[PDB]
Design a binder for this molecule. Sequence first.
Ligand SMILES: *[C@@H]1O[C@H](CO)[C@@H](O[C@@H]2O[C@H](CO)[C@@H](O[C@@H]3O[C@H](CO)[C@@H](O)[C@H](O)[C@@H]3O)[C@H](O)[C@H]2NC(C)=O)[C@H](O)[C@H]1NC(C)=O
Ligand SMILES: *[C@@H]1O[C@H](CO)[C@@H](O[C@@H]2O[C@H](CO)[C@@H](O[C@@H]3O[C@H](CO)[C@@H](O)[C@H](O)[C@@H]3O)[C@H](O)[C@H]2NC(C)=O)[C@H](O)[C@H]1NC(C)=O
Ligand SMILES: *[C@@H]1O[C@H](CO)[C@@H](O[C@@H]2O[C@H](CO)[C@@H](O[C@@H]3O[C@H](CO)[C@@H](O)[C@H](O)[C@@H]3O)[C@H](O)[C@H]2NC(C)=O)[C@H](O)[C@H]1NC(C)=O
Ligand SMILES: *[C@@H]1O[C@H](CO)[C@@H](O[C@@H]2O[C@H](CO)[C@@H](O[C@@H]3O[C@H](CO)[C@@H](O)[C@H](O)[C@@H]3O)[C@H](O)[C@H]2NC(C)=O)[C@H](O)[C@H]1NC(C)=O
Ligand SMILES: *[C@@H]1O[C@H](CO)[C@@H](O[C@@H]2O[C@H](CO)[C@@H](O[C@@H]3O[C@H](CO)[C@@H](O)[C@H](O)[C@@H]3O)[C@H](O)[C@H]2NC(C)=O)[C@H](O)[C@H]1NC(C)=O
Ligand SMILES: *[C@@H]1O[C@H](CO)[C@@H](O[C@@H]2O[C@H](CO)[C@@H](O[C@@H]3O[C@H](CO)[C@@H](O)[C@H](O)[C@@H]3O)[C@H](O)[C@H]2NC(C)=O)[C@H](O)[C@H]1NC(C)=O
Ligand SMILES: *[C@@H]1O[C@H](CO)[C@@H](O[C@@H]2O[C@H](CO)[C@@H](O[C@H]3O[C@H](CO)[C@@H](O)[C@H](O)[C@@H]3O)[C@H](O)[C@H]2NC(C)=O)[C@H](O)[C@H]1NC(C)=O
Ligand SMILES: *[C@@H]1O[C@H](CO)[C@@H](O[C@@H]2O[C@H](CO)[C@@H](O[C@H]3O[C@H](CO)[C@@H](O)[C@H](O)[C@@H]3O)[C@H](O)[C@H]2NC(C)=O)[C@H](O)[C@H]1NC(C)=O
Ligand SMILES: *[C@@H]1O[C@H](CO)[C@@H](O[C@@H]2O[C@H](CO)[C@@H](O[C@H]3O[C@H](CO)[C@@H](O)[C@H](O)[C@@H]3O)[C@H](O)[C@H]2NC(C)=O)[C@H](O)[C@H]1NC(C)=O
Ligand SMILES: *[C@@H]1O[C@H](CO)[C@@H](O)[C@H](O)[C@H]1NC(C)=O
Ligand SMILES: *[C@@H]1O[C@H](CO)[C@@H](O)[C@H](O)[C@H]1NC(C)=O
Ligand SMILES: *[C@@H]1O[C@H](CO)[C@@H](O)[C@H](O)[C@H]1NC(C)=O
Ligand SMILES: *[C@H]1O[C@H](CO)[C@@H](O)[C@H](O)[C@H]1NC(C)=O
Ligand SMILES: *[C@H]1O[C@H](CO)[C@@H](O)[C@H](O)[C@H]1NC(C)=O
Ligand SMILES: *[C@H]1O[C@H](CO)[C@@H](O)[C@H](O)[C@H]1NC(C)=O
Lengths: 494, 494, 494
Amino acid sequence: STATLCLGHHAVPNGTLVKTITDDQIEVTNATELVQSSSTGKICNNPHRILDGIDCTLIDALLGDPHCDVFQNETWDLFVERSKAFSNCYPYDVPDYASLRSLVASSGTLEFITEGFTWTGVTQNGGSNACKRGPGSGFFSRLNWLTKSGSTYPVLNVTMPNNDNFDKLYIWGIHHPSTNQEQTSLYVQASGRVTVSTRRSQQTIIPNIGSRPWVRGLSSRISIYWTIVKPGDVLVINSNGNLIAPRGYFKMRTGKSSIMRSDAPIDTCISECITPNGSIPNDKPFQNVNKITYGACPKYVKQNTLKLATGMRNVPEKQTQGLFGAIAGFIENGWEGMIDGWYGFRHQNSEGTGQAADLKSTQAAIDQINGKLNRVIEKTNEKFHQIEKEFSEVEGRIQDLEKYVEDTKIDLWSYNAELLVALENQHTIDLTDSEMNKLFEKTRRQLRENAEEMGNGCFKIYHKCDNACIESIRNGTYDHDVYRNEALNNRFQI
Amino acid sequence: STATLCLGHHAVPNGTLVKTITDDQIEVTNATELVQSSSTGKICNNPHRILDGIDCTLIDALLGDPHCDVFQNETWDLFVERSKAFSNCYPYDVPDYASLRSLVASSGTLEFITEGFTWTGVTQNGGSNACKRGPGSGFFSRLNWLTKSGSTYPVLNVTMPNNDNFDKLYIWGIHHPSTNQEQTSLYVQASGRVTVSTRRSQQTIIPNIGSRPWVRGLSSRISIYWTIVKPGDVLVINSNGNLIAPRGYFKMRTGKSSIMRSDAPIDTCISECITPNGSIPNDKPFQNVNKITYGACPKYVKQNTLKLATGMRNVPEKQTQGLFGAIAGFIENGWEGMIDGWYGFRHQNSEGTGQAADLKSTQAAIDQINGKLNRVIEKTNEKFHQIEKEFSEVEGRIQDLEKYVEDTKIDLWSYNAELLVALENQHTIDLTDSEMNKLFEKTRRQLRENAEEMGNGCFKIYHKCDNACIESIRNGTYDHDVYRNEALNNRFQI
Amino acid sequence: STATLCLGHHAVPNGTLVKTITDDQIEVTNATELVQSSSTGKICNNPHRILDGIDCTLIDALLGDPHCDVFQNETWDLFVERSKAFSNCYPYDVPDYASLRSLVASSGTLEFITEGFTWTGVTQNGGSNACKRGPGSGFFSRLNWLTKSGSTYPVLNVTMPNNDNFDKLYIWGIHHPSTNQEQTSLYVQASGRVTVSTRRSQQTIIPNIGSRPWVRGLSSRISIYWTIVKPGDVLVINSNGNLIAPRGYFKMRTGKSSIMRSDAPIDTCISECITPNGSIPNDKPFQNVNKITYGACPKYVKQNTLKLATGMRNVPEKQTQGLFGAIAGFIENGWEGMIDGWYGFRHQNSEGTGQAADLKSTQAAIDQINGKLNRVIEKTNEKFHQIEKEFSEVEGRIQDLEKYVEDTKIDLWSYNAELLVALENQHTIDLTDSEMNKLFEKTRRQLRENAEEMGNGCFKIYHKCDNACIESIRNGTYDHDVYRNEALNNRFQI
Ligand SMILES: *[C@@H]1O[C@H](CO)[C@@H](O[C@@H]2O[C@H](CO)[C@@H](O[C@@H]3O[C@H](CO)[C@@H](O)[C@H](O)[C@@H]3O)[C@H](O)[C@H]2NC(C)=O)[C@H](O)[C@H]1NC(C)=O
Ligand SMILES: *[C@@H]1O[C@H](CO)[C@@H](O[C@@H]2O[C@H](CO)[C@@H](O[C@@H]3O[C@H](CO)[C@@H](O)[C@H](O)[C@@H]3O)[C@H](O)[C@H]2NC(C)=O)[C@H](O)[C@H]1NC(C)=O
Ligand SMILES: *[C@@H]1O[C@H](CO)[C@@H](O[C@@H]2O[C@H](CO)[C@@H](O[C@@H]3O[C@H](CO)[C@@H](O)[C@H](O)[C@@H]3O)[C@H](O)[C@H]2NC(C)=O)[C@H](O)[C@H]1NC(C)=O
Ligand SMILES: *[C@@H]1O[C@H](CO)[C@@H](O[C@@H]2O[C@H](CO)[C@@H](O[C@@H]3O[C@H](CO)[C@@H](O)[C@H](O)[C@@H]3O)[C@H](O)[C@H]2NC(C)=O)[C@H](O)[C@H]1NC(C)=O
Ligand SMILES: *[C@@H]1O[C@H](CO)[C@@H](O[C@@H]2O[C@H](CO)[C@@H](O[C@@H]3O[C@H](CO)[C@@H](O)[C@H](O)[C@@H]3O)[C@H](O)[C@H]2NC(C)=O)[C@H](O)[C@H]1NC(C)=O
Ligand SMILES: *[C@@H]1O[C@H](CO)[C@@H](O[C@@H]2O[C@H](CO)[C@@H](O[C@@H]3O[C@H](CO)[C@@H](O)[C@H](O)[C@@H]3O)[C@H](O)[C@H]2NC(C)=O)[C@H](O)[C@H]1NC(C)=O
Ligand SMILES: *[C@@H]1O[C@H](CO)[C@@H](O[C@@H]2O[C@H](CO)[C@@H](O[C@H]3O[C@H](CO)[C@@H](O)[C@H](O)[C@@H]3O)[C@H](O)[C@H]2NC(C)=O)[C@H](O)[C@H]1NC(C)=O
Ligand SMILES: *[C@@H]1O[C@H](CO)[C@@H](O[C@@H]2O[C@H](CO)[C@@H](O[C@H]3O[C@H](CO)[C@@H](O)[C@H](O)[C@@H]3O)[C@H](O)[C@H]2NC(C)=O)[C@H](O)[C@H]1NC(C)=O
Ligand SMILES: *[C@@H]1O[C@H](CO)[C@@H](O[C@@H]2O[C@H](CO)[C@@H](O[C@H]3O[C@H](CO)[C@@H](O)[C@H](O)[C@@H]3O)[C@H](O)[C@H]2NC(C)=O)[C@H](O)[C@H]1NC(C)=O
Ligand SMILES: *[C@@H]1O[C@H](CO)[C@@H](O)[C@H](O)[C@H]1NC(C)=O
Ligand SMILES: *[C@@H]1O[C@H](CO)[C@@H](O)[C@H](O)[C@H]1NC(C)=O
Ligand SMILES: *[C@@H]1O[C@H](CO)[C@@H](O)[C@H](O)[C@H]1NC(C)=O
Ligand SMILES: *[C@H]1O[C@H](CO)[C@@H](O)[C@H](O)[C@H]1NC(C)=O
Ligand SMILES: *[C@H]1O[C@H](CO)[C@@H](O)[C@H](O)[C@H]1NC(C)=O
Ligand SMILES: *[C@H]1O[C@H](CO)[C@@H](O)[C@H](O)[C@H]1NC(C)=O
C-alpha cells in the first residue's frame, strides 16, 4: 500500500570535540587544528638568508673582534646569535648596546667602506694582547687606536663629507684609562675628550679614568658610540686624547633583516617561518611555539590547541548506540553507514530497502566549510624586525613597556583566536543542520499531499513507490499528480 | 476553480559583492562602504585651530628664532610643521628634541611670561650674525646670552620661585665653544658649567669644547635643555660660564593640542578629522588614508575597502537570467519588477495577474539594517596627542617599540574590521531571508487547508479567489472558513 | 467535538533591556551585569601581602631614610605608596627613579645583606642634620658616607665578588657639593669622581658642584645610581672623592610583586583583585573601576555597563498588555502566568482549561544559557607588575608611548566587550526562540493529520481530547492513530 523514505546525515565512529558559543565540548565528524604547537628544532636556510653568528654577536662582528672578521662585509636576512658566543678582544661596552644591535641588524649588512682618515700628529694602529690577532697584539679591525707620537697629541680635527647618496653609519669610541698614569702616557693630556658631530648632531664623550674588573688582562675599557651621517651632511671628529677613531663607514640599508637569539641548528630546508625553537610550518593561523618570530608566521597565542570543526555534529544530540533497521530519519541519529555522502536517503518499499546519498547538499556543506577554511588560513602576515621579548638584564621602565606591549598583544590575539574558533564552529554546525533540514523540506514539498512526516525525519509515502519511484524523489523529478489519487485514498481512509 | 499566490523578494539588475563567513564574494542588492580611502588634500581650519608653522618648527617658534617670533605667544589645537621649514639662528641641538617637541605641542601654547632675572657680573643680550635679527646680529628671542663683563664671570646663582598656581616650563641652554680660546674669551674660566635645579630635580651640563661642522658661520653650538617648575617649588640656576639663560617661562597647560607634520594646504572648511594627507570625512568607521590622525576619526586599517551589506541577496543563489510569467515564488528567483518593496506577493487568478509588495516585512528588514548601520557608525573616537609613527632618523630601541605598538594596533583593528563586516553581512543575509521565510509562513497559516505549497514559493489556492480575495490574504483578514468547503472539495478529489 | 492546545513561553512583568546586532534596546526576561563598576574602598590584606608604605616611598625604604627603616628587610606582594609619604633625610635625586622603583618593586624584597667593605684612607659613617636619626645627625641606613681622614682622600679601589648564586643589587651614590669649598673640605680633590663597574657594565659619575634649592637645610645633593652584579661577576668601586658607598647588596628576586600608589585604607578581608580605588570582586569579566590593577582582575573597559541576556525576549515583539482567556500561543504573547517553566502548554478542552510547562525545553534553554555564562566568566587573568598609567610629571616621548599603549589596549578590550555582549545576546535570543519553535514542531508532528495550526501558536485538535489525552501529547506518548478517524472526519467535513 505505502512506502517509507527517511532523510538523513552521516556519522562516524571516532569523532572529535570542539568549542562553540554554548558547549565547550560538542562532537563533530571532523576538525582541523589551528594552533601549530611543534617545531622541527632546525632553522631552514631557505628562503631567508640565515647568517649563523656562531662564536660572534652582531656587535663583535661589527667592531671587528679578531675571531669575527670572517663576517666582514656580511649580509643577512636573519643573524642568529649563539648563546656560546664570546668576545675575545679589547674589553669594551656599548652604551645603548641594544639600539646599536637593533639598527645594524635591520640594516642587514656590515658592508664596510674604509674612508682614509688622515690622523696627523699621532699615527694609527694601536694593539693589545687582549685582542690578539694572529701572532701578537691586535685590535678591532674596524676601529683605529690612536695614541701619542713622539711626545704629544695634537688636537685632532678632521672631517669627512657624505657626498654619497646614502646614510653612513660611523662606529667610533673612547678609551677609559685604568690610571691617570696610563691616560698621560698614551694621550699626554691629563684628560682627553672626544666629540663626533655632523651639522645636526653632536656627541662629546669624556674619558673617565678608573679601575674596572680585570678582563682579558685589563682594567681599562673602551666605550663604543656611533654616528649616522645623512647625504650632503658631513662628519667632524675633534679630540685631544682617547680617540678610538673609526676607519670608515658601514653602508646603511633598510629591509626585512633582523637578528634572532637561538641555539637551533641551522639546516638545509625550506620554511618561511623562523622561531628560536626552529622553523615552524605557517600553514595554520596561530602558533604556540614562541612569540619571537621572523617571516610569514602564524600569530602567537597562549592556547596550545584550537580545533576548527570541518564537519557536522556526530550521531545527533550524542553519546553511544542502538536501535536497528525499521528506518529512522535524521532526528536523533546519524547514519554511520553513509560513507558515500554527508546527507542522503534511505527507503523501505516493495522492492526492499536501500540508501542513496544526496551529493547536492553533501557538496554545499562541504563547500561552505572549505570556504571558511580557506578564509581562516588565507592570510600570511610577514613580520621581520620587531621588538625583543626576552631579556638578559633587569632594566625597568623600558623593559616593562616592551614586555607589556607583547603580553597585551598576545592576550588580544588569544581572545581573537578563541572567539573566531567558537563563532566558526557555531556557524559550521548551524550550516550543516541547515543543509539537512533544507533537504527534508525540499522532499516535503515534492511529496505534497502524497505523504506524511512521521516525526522521525521520515515520510510515510501513502502509495506504491518502487525503487524507480524512490529514485525520482531523490532526483527532483517526482511527479506527485501521478500518485495523488492513490495517496489521497490510502491517506484519508483505508 | 483555483488561484495562485506566490511570495517573493525583490532583486536589482546591478548588485554588489560582499564578504561573509563562508563566501568571500556573495551578491546583495546593496552595500555601504566602511573604509574612507580618499582625502581632499586640504586641512580644514575648522573646528580645530590649525597653526601653520610654515618656515618654522615648534622648537624654533619656542626658542625664538628670528624668523619665527611671529608665533610669539601663539596657541593652537594642531601645529602643522612644514617640510620646507628651516632654522636661521644660532646652530643648536636639543637633546631629547622629540620630547620637548611633544610636551610643548601638547601644552598647545607658547605663552611666554618674562620674569626678570637679575644677572649681576655679566650683563645680558649676546648676539650672533648667524641669528641676524633685523640689521645686525641677534639671538633666540626667548634665550638670554650671557658673556663676560669687564674681565670676569662671577658664579651666577639666582633663583625664581613658582608662587603661581601652574607649571612653568623654563627653556635654557649651554654654549659649546669651538676652541678653548673662545671659551676663555667669553666666559673667562677654562671650563664653565651650568646647573638648573628645583627642589626635586637637578641638571648640571658641562660645556664641551670642540669644532663641529660650520653651520651659518660657526663651529660652536648651543645645547637646549628644559626645566619644569611645579607650584610652590622654586628654580635655582647656578653657573660659572656658558649659560644661555632663560628669559622667563612658558605657561604650561593640558588639552587636546598636538602637532602634525604635513604638507597639505590649509583651507577654510569644516572637518573634525585631520590626517597629514588632508582632512577626511569621519562618517565611516574605518579609514585607510593614514595612521597619523587628529580629531574624531575613523580607525585606521590596512584594508582599502570593506563593504557592509545593506540589502538581501540578489536574484537567489545567483548569476544570470530566464523563465517568464507562470508565477514563481521566492525560491530560486527574486523579482526585479518589485521596486515598490523588498518582499511581496504576485497572484494569478480569475481577474488576471498582478503584484503587491508587503510593507510590513519590507520595513522590518529595512529597519534592522538601519539598526546595525547606526550601530556600525554611531561612534566617534576623538584622539589628540598620540605617538609619532613616521621617523626621520634611525634610533633603534625606542623607535622599534613605537613602530611595533602601532603596527600591533593597526593589525588588531584591521582584523576587527574584517570580522565585523563578515559577521554583520552574514547576519543581514540571514535577517533578510528570515523576513521572507516569515511572510511565507504567515500566509501558510492564513490559508489553512485551503491551499498547498507548490514548492516554488507559491501556494496553489484551491478556490475562487478574485482580487478582493487576494487582497484579504495580503492584509491578514482572510477568513478561511468561508472557502474551506470549496477548497476541501477541489483539493481532495475533483 | 474538538479541543485546543497552544504552545508558549513565559514572560515577566518587570524585564530588562540589552543590546544586540540590530536592536540597542531589546527586552529580555533577565540579564546579568558584566562590568564591575564599584569598589569597596578598602584594600584586602588577603590573599596578597600588602605592605603599606605609609609615610614612605619604596625608594626611601630602600635607601634607608631614618623614618623608613621599619621596612628594613621587608617583603611584599604589593607595596602601597601613600600620597602623604615624605622624605626626611639627605636631599637626593634618583636619575631614572621610575626604573629603580620598578625593578625593586618587582623584586618584592628589600632583603639587605651587609658585605663589609674596607674603606682604607677615609673611615665611614658620615651624617647630616637633614637626616636626623634619633638624637643627632644620621644618614641613609643603607648608604655609607665617606669623607676625608686626617687630610687626604686616597683613590678608593675596592672590589666585591659575586660568588653567590643570585643577582645582587647594589645601590650607591655620589655627592654634589654646594660650593667648591665644600667639595675640597670633604673630599680634598678639586673634583672627585665615582666609577662603579662589573666585568660587563661600568658607570662613572662626576660630582657636579652648585647651589640647589635649600631642602632640609642644604643646597647640596646626593644622586643615586645602582649596579646589579650577576653570579661569578664582580663589582669594582673606584673613586677619588664624593663616594656615597653602598653597605652591601639587596638580594634580587622575580615574582608577582609590584607597587601601587593608593590612598585606600587597607582592610582585613579577602579579594584577589586590587585597584587603587580599593579591592573589587573579579567575578565579572570586565571592570570600569580603574585601569591600574593587581591580581586576578576583570579587564578594564570604558563601559560602565554591559548586560548579558540570561533569558528570552519578554512578551513577544513588545510593549504593554491585553486580550484574555480564549487561549493563544507563543506568537505575539508570552505567558506571565507560567512561572513553573520557560516554555509549556495551555489547553482548552472538555474538562476545562489549564497549563503545564515543558521542562525539556525549559532546561535546554537554561542549560545553553548557563553554558555561555560560565564561558563568559570562566577566565581569571592574573596580572602583576605592569606599566604605570598615571604620571605626576611631564616627560614626553616615554610617557606618550606608555599612555598610548594602555589607551590602545583599553579601546580594544572595550570593543571586544561590546561585540561579545551583542553576539552573545543575539545568540541567546535565537537560542530561546529556537527552543520554543522546536517544541511547537515536535507537537506538530505528534498530532499528524489530527490537528491544524491555528496560526496563533495553537493547534486546533479535531477530536475529543480530555486532560489525560492532553497529557499524552505533552509527554510524547500521544498515539495519533487512535483518534485519526474521528479527526479525519471532524476535519474534512462536519
Ligand atoms: C577531515 O578534516 C581534514 C581537515 O579539514 C580534511 O583534510 C583535508 O582534506 C582536503 C580535501 O581532501 C585536503 O585538500 C588538499 O589540498 C591540497 C592543497 O595543495 C591538494 O594538493 C590536495 O589535492 C587536496 O585538495 C587537505 O589538504 C586536507 N588537510 C587539511 C589540513 O585541510 C579531511 O578531508 C576531512 N574529512 C574527513 C572525512 O576526514
Ligand atoms: C676643524 O675642521 C674644519 C673643517 O673640517 C676646519 O675648516 C673649516 O671648515 C668649514 C667646513 O666644515 C669651512 O666652511 C667654509 O667656510 C668658507 C669661508 O670662506 C665658506 O665660504 C664656505 O661656505 C664654508 O662655510 C671653513 O672655511 C673651514 N676653514 C676654516 C679656516 O675655518 C676648521 O678650521 C678646523 N678647526 C677649527 C678650530 O674649526
Ligand atoms: C543603498 O545603500 C545606501 C547605503 O545604505 C543607501 O543610502 C542611504 O540611504 C539612507 C535612506 O535613504 C540615507 O539616509 C539619509 O540620512 C540623512 C542623515 O542626515 C538624512 O538627512 C536623509 O533625509 C536620509 O534619511 C543615507 O544618507 C544614504 N547614504 C548612506 C551612506 O547611508 C540607499 O538608500 C540604499 N538603498 C538602495 C535601494 O539603493
Ligand atoms: C644661592 O641662592 C640661594 C637662594 O636662591 C642663596 O640663599 C639661600 O637660599 C635659601 C632658599 O633657596 C634660603 O633658605 C632659607 O634659609 C633660612 C635661614 O634662616 C630659613 O629660615 C628658611 O626657612 C629657608 O630655608 C637661605 O637662607 C638663603 N640664604 C643663605 C645665606 O643661604 C644661597 O646662599 C646662594 N648661594 C649659595 C652658595 O647657596
Ligand atoms: C536572572 O539572572 C540571574 C543572572 O543569570 C540569575 O542569578 C543566578 O542564578 C544562578 C542559579 O539560580 C545562581 O547560581 C548559583 O551559583 C552558586 C555558585 O557558587 C551556587 O552556590 C548556588 O547554589 C547557585 O547554583 C547564580 O549565583 C545567580 N547569580 C548570578 C550572578 O549568576 C537568576 O537566577 C536569573 N533567573 C531569574 C528567573 O531571575
Ligand atoms: C684595583 O682593584 C683590583 C682588584 O679589585 C686590583 O687588583 C687586581 O685585580 C684583578 C682582579 O680584579 C687581578 O686579576 C688577576 O690577575 C692575576 C695576575 O697574576 C691573574 O693570574 C688572574 O687570573 C686574575 O686575572 C689582578 O691580579 C689584581 N692585582 C693586581 C696587582 O693588579 C688592582 O690592582 C687595583 N688597582 C688598580 C690600579 O687596578
Ligand atoms: C620553545 O622554546 C621555549 C623556550 O624558549 C619553551 O618554553 C619553555 O621550555 C622549557 C623546556 O624547554 C620549560 O621548562 C621545562 O622544565 C620544567 C621543569 O622540568 C618542565 O615542567 C617543563 O615542562 C619543561 O620541561 C618552560 O616551562 C617552557 N615555558 C616557557 C613559557 O618558556 C617552549 O616550550 C618551546 N616550545 C616548543 C613548541 O618547542
Ligand atoms: C596618504 O599619504 C601617504 C604618505 O604619507 C601615502 O602613501 C604612500 O604614497 C606614495 C605616493 O604618494 C606611494 O608611492 C608612490 O610611488 C610608487 C612608485 O611610483 C607607486 O607605486 C605608488 O602607487 C605611489 O605612486 C607609497 O607607496 C604610498 N604608500 C605608503 C604605505 O606610504 C598614501 O597613499 C596617502 N593616502 C591617501 C588616501 O591619500
Ligand atoms: C576610581 O578612581 C578614579 C580616580 O583614580 C575615579 O576617577 C575620577 O574620580 C573623580 C572623583 O573621585 C572624578 O571627578 C569628580 O569631580 C567632578 C567635578 O565635581 C565630577 O564631575 C565627577 O563626577 C567627580 O565627582 C573624575 O572625573 C573621575 N574620572 C576619571 C577618569 O578619573 C573613578 O571614578 C573611581 N572609580 C570608582 C568605581 O571608584
Ligand atoms: C574512539 O575515539 C578515540 C579516537 O581514536 C579512541 O580513544 C577510542 O578508543 C575510539 N573507540 C574505540 C572503540 O577504539
Ligand atoms: C552591472 O554591473 C556593473 C555595475 O554597473 C557593470 O559593470 C555592468 O556592466 C552592469 N551591467 C550592464 C549590462 O551594464
Ligand atoms: C517595571 O520596570 C521597572 C523595574 O522595577 C520599574 O521602573 C517600573 O515601575 C516597573 N513597573 C511598575 C508598575 O512598577
Ligand atoms: C668589503 O666591502 C668593501 C666595500 O664594498 C670592499 O672595498 C672590501 O674590499 C671588502 N672586503 C672584504 C673582506 O670583503
Ligand atoms: C605675550 O604674552 C605675555 C604673557 O601673557 C605678554 O606679557 C606679552 O606682552 C605678550 N607678547 C606678545 C608678543 O604677544
Ligand atoms: C635583615 O636581613 C639580613 C639578611 O637576611 C640579616 O642579616 C639582618 O640581620 C636582618 N636585619 C633586619 C633588621 O631584619
